[PDB]
User: What shape does this take?
Amino acid sequence: TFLVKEDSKNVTAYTPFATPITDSKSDLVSLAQLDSSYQIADQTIHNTNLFVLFKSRDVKVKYESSGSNNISFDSTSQGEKPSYVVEFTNSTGIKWTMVKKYQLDVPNVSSDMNQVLKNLILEQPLTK
Amino acid sequence: SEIGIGDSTFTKMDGKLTGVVSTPLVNLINGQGATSDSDTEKISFKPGNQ
Assistant: This one.
């Protein structure tokens, strides 16, 4: 059977005859136990399980030139929304169930790294 | 009746009798009374799409 991303959060399964499977439209963001700001960024099939990348529209990160923990989530602005990778499986039609959930933490910064970063400058992104 | 000599029983039928349509399951006079058959009404095929 084939999987179809209906929107930024739901996934519907279709049979080989191009017909949808009834009661297969699954909200994987909810199933992954993640809030409304999250949306599926990428999906892949390994083993027989579905692997899904999620990322929040509410994420806020900070850079402080001083200290040891130079890169971190802006907890103060309700932007402590890290990305996650979730493994999903079939317990059945199609019924999804979460296997493993992996968070994507911010990078670790060394004193040698922070000396460059301190004065690191970036050009505005190229647009259409 | 014990020797096998007797009278035939009669069932009245409405209208004009012309013939009978006999299948290995049913005998219908003038081909009237054809039904779906109650036994096999709960048995069907799984559609190819699913």
About this structure: The first strand of chain B starts at residue 20 and ends at 22.
